[PDB]
Amino acid sequence: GPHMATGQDRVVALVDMDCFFVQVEQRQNPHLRNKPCAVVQYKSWKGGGIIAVSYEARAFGVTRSMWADDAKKLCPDLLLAQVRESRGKANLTKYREASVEVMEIMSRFAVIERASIDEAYVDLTSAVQERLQKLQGQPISADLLPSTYIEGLPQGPTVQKEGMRKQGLFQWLDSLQIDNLTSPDLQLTVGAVIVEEMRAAIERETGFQCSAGISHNKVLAKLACGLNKPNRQTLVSHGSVPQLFSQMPIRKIRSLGGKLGASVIEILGIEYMGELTQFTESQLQSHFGEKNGSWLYAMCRGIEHDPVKPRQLPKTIGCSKNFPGKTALATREQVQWWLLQLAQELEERLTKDRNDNDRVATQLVVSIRVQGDKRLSSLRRCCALTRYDAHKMSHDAFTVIKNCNTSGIQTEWSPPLTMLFLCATKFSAS
DNA sequence: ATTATGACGCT
DNA sequence: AGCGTCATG
Ligand SMILES: [Mn+2]
Ligand SMILES: [Mn+2]
Ligand SMILES: [Mn+2]
């Protein structure tokens, strides 16, 4: 009744760059613009592995994780850009620097949570209160929302996509209570006005397009962002959740796409998010644990409390490389040379980080994989990180892993190593 | 041989 | 602390 919390207290946006690494390469090389194109790392094995795909190329069925040679079978005119190689490994610096460009623009509008290289959440609650007070009670014009979709609309009693978008928006704005500074639908609408502004600033000042979702929490914002890509934004209201979730596969919700979501489906015998509403909180907690159970109980009703953390910088800085199959490292000389390559990239990135961001990492995590181990990581050990020196870091990592060589021969390495990873963690202000 | 990361939960 | 899970540019 009057005391149930509906989870409509916040306005939260998720901004996600469209096919980000492709756009970075297309800005640099105008010959790639408005073409089917993709970004690859390496080249010798099956033409390299695709990690990003332009929307033109997605129309041919090109996806991430495809080998470029197979993608060329689907799309013979596919254009390819390769990630830079430094010290024998992929080097993602260009895309990290482009990410910082975008994140710095977003930070002008509100504090953001960097969620990945290409995406950030925005807590717009306060910016919305301010813009509302500025607007007094002036209605919101459709012209302020030129790329916005309202999920669920139009409905009730033209065959073009843009025409449908405008119809849905008109129904939404016609139903608005613009006289109530506390109406959640109004607050989301003003949030969407602000996100149109943020996205226009990003495009004007970087050349990069993005999509976005606007809702009352992070999971709904992320889901909304996905609904109308590319170069569009979507408002998911509290009221739109029952219909949206009634046919939503559970795996589409962030954190339910792996084993936990499979167990929800199998144990409860359901397929769609909305079906979760029929279980009690205690029932869900009995199957999935206290935390997951309470989260699922609120989430299937559109309610989630995870805050937008004030964090625009990555918490860890890491360097990793796989050595698959016949290229696994089988001598100490090899292991030490590759630890040095990784350590040198880490030193470069860490020194830049210290100059830009006034912090220093204090812990070094060393991770390896051995041949014949299914797990991603086979051993993960930490050591102190007291100096930004690649030779010291590689010697320290070798010291923490050298007891892994089950070879009686001290020159050989067995079983051979199929992955090396160096990660700097536990930052302190300096 | 589906690679390079990066956040977070569990014990 | 070390491991597992979820996410994917
Ligand atoms: Mn993206
Ligand atoms: Mn993303
Ligand atoms: Mn993606």
Q: Which residue has the tokens 């990492």?
A: A361
Q: Which of A271, A280, A319 is nearest to A301 (CA)?
A: A280
Residue A375 DSSP code: S
The residue numbers preceding gaps of C to N over 2.5 A in chain A are 157
- What is the CB neighbour count within 10 angstroms for residue A23? 25
Judgement on whether residues A327 and A403 belong to the same structural domain of the protein = yes
The answer to whether A17 is annotated as binding is: yes
Contacts of A256 (CB under 8 A, 6+ apart): A250, A264
Q: Which residue has the tokens 């929307």?
A: A55
A421-CA/B1-C1' distance, Å: 18
Judgement on whether residues A66 and A197 belong to the same structural domain of the protein = no
Q: Which of A69, A88, A107 is the last residue of a domain?
A: A88
Judgement on whether residues A282 and A332 belong to the same structural domain of the protein = no
Experimental method: X-ray
8 Å CB contact between A363 and A425: yes
Q: CA–CA separation, A112 vs A126, rounded Å?
A: 13
Q: Which of A292, A307, A322 is the last residue of a domain?
A: A307
Q: Which of A39, A73, A88 is the last residue of a domain?
A: A88
Q: CA–CA separation, A402 vs A383, rounded Å?
A: 13
Judgement on whether residues A330 and A428 belong to the same structural domain of the protein = yes
Residue A143 DSSP code: G
Domain range holding A50? 19-88
Measured over the CA atoms of residue A259, residue A260, residue A265 and residue A268, the dihedral's sign is: positive
Judgement on whether residues A24 and A148 belong to the same structural domain of the protein = no
Q: From the alpha carbon of A44, which nucleotide's C1' atom is closest?
A: B1
8 Å CB contact between A422 and A380: no
In this complex, the residue with its CA at the shortest distance from the C1' of nucleotide C2 is A380
Judgement on whether residues A213 and A134 belong to the same structural domain of the protein = yes
Judgement on whether residues A159 and A218 belong to the same structural domain of the protein = yes
Q: From the alpha carbon of A39, which nucleotide's C1' atom is closest?
A: C9
Q: CA–CA separation, A255 vs A135, rounded Å?
A: 38
Structure tokens at A103: 């994140």
Q: CA–CA separation, A369 vs A64, rounded Å?
A: 24
Judgement on whether residues A224 and A84 belong to the same structural domain of the protein = no
Judgement on whether residues A14 and A28 belong to the same structural domain of the protein = no
Residue A53 DSSP code: E
Alpha carbon A4 to chain centroid, angstroms = 32
* φ, ψ dihedrals at A198, nearest 5°: -60, -45
Judgement on whether residues A419 and A406 belong to the same structural domain of the protein = yes
Judgement on whether residues A298 and A158 belong to the same structural domain of the protein = no
Q: Which of A18, A355, A400 is nearest to A209 (CA)?
A: A18
Alpha carbon distance, N-terminus to C-terminus of chain A? 52
A122-CA/B5-C1' distance, Å: 23
Judgement on whether residues A154 and A178 belong to the same structural domain of the protein = yes
The answer to whether A10 is annotated as binding is: no
The helix (run of H) or strand (run of E) holding residue A195 is: helix A184-206
CA triple A108-A109-A110, angle to 5 deg: 100
Number of domains in chain A: 4
- List residues with CB under 7 Å of strand B: A 41-42, 44-45, 49, 51, 64-65, 67, 89-92, 96, 117, 289, 291-292, 309, 314-322, 324-327, 345, 376, 421, 423
8 Å CB contact between A316 and A424: yes
- A19 C-alpha to center of ligand 3: Å? 7
SS3 call for A162: helix
Q: Which of A102, A245, A259, A128 is nearest to A182 (CA)?
A: A128
Resolution (A): 1.6
Calculate the alpha carbon distances from A147 to A234, A235, A324 in Å.
Answer: 8, 11, 45
